[PDB]
Design a protein around this ligand. Structure first.
Ligand code: SAM
Ligand code: SAM
Lengths: 236, 236
């Protein structure tokens, strides 16, 4: 039911299921070639902290994708969807009814707090030290800036990401959008995450053996057939 | 009047003087043994961005003070006041009529957005990975937390500093507190900063030669007596 050594219990189940109930699948960040592992990690961490289920990345090149890989996998509870180009990502995100906000200084750029983050929203962050591409700018609905009232006129991309995600968290919390009886996530995503998060080592074993993820009940116990248990316990 | 090569002109003067008019000397952050240069730098940068004139640090040990020194000097427009102990810093800041907010999880801790940042305020940030000291906690007026709605329950100290400083910037901007005809800074601080910021290389030369800083006029020109100019130009 609950394998020895594993942390799962009725309480950790509750904590996980409450965390999924708070998940905001219509809110995301998209990293346009943001590739330094410390930035990718810090951005994912804030994404989790404001209830983002999935973040997006444009890592065109193989070295960029590989350097970023461990950081991309640093959080069991945030998946990273990779796109070849900003055209593909924005198409995909517009496809999900999301407004596309480009973190970018221009004459048309608006204070990031003037935005309604309670609607489906993608926050677009650009690279060190070059900013979002002209192509991305052409696809975005609106430029947003974080006002800087001193002499410096640039922030690190992790700090800028955190500030915009937490303005979304503020407005969503003020609108009560983290208080939910059920997750906005489909039941299948919730079971995937309960297992892949709750039993991260067993989820890898299941994948390698090409087995389905089993059901997890409110005790946090694994419910599966003798055949699943036997295959999962076989070498290796 | 304006030495050759220097950036100062009537426009850079305006930008500097408008920046001093926006300065919020009753708002600060105090770093309790926050010593990693990347964190000290990133915290100072956000401090500048929300109008902080002076930040505070508790760096008890000589190696901590030295490792942090370049980061402490990374921004011409933010001074760092060092204190031997948290007792000395909090005494000094309570002395300036500031409420002391400890970034710290407890049963008594309040959402950081519930705070009135429009009043004199010190944000107290604690070290990696240990948090604010029990002694600091005993001196603080109130614990604040940044709510984290996912599984992770910790942010990097630079990201947490940025989020609380920008909640102060939000509330201060909403109250119009960055729109001022004159600086809240004394005239003497404004001239110090105009010269030390506007002419950072000459301010060091003035100090080494033990000369006073001269007057800077609205053209951004240096106004000083033949004697100052002669001493400043002498070897070396
Ligand atoms: C030029 S990169 C900074 C370098 C990078 N963080 C590093 O570690 O080297 C800054 C990016 O963060 C965001 N950003 C930075 N400063 C900003 C500001 N003042 N307003 C809005 N967005 C900002 C933008 O997406 C921009 O592309
Ligand atoms: C434990 S240190 C993190 C390690 C350090 N940033 C590093 O580079 O290794 C976290 C500090 O940031 C602040 N902080 C972090 N997470 C926070 C949260 N969820 N709520 C409030 N403050 C937080 C507190 O001052 C705390 O002492």
């Amino acid at each position: 039911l609950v394998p020895r050594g594993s942390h799962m219990n009725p309480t950790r189940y509750a904590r996980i299921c409450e965390m999924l109930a708070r998940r905001q699948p219509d809110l995301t960040v998209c990293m346009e070639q943001v590739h330094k592992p410390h930035n990718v990690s810090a951005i994912i961490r804030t994404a989790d902290a404001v209830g983002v289920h999935e973040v997006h990345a444009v890592w065109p090149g193989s070295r960029m994708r590989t350097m970023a890989s461990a950081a991309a996998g640093s959080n069991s509870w945030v998946q990273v969807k990779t796109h070849r180009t900003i055209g593909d990502a924005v198409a995909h995100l517009k496809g999900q009814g999301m407004q596309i906000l480009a973190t970018h200084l221009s004459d048309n750029a608006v204070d990031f707090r003037g935005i309604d983050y309670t609607r489906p929203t993608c926050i677009l962050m650009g690279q060190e030290k070059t900013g979002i591409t002209q192509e991305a700018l052409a696809l975005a609905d609106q430029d947003i800036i974080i006002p800087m009232i001193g002499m410096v006129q640039s922030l690190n991309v992790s700090v800028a990401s955190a500030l915009i995600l937490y303005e979304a968290q503020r407005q969503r919390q003020n609108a009560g959008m983290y208080l939910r009886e059920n997750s906005m996530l489909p039941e299948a995503e919730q079971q995937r995450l309960l297992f892949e998060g709750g039993y991260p080592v067993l989820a890898k074993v299941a994948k390698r053996k090409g087995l389905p993820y089993p059901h997890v009940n409110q005790q946090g116990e694994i419910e599966a057939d003798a055949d699943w248990w036997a295959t999962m316990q076989a070498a290796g």
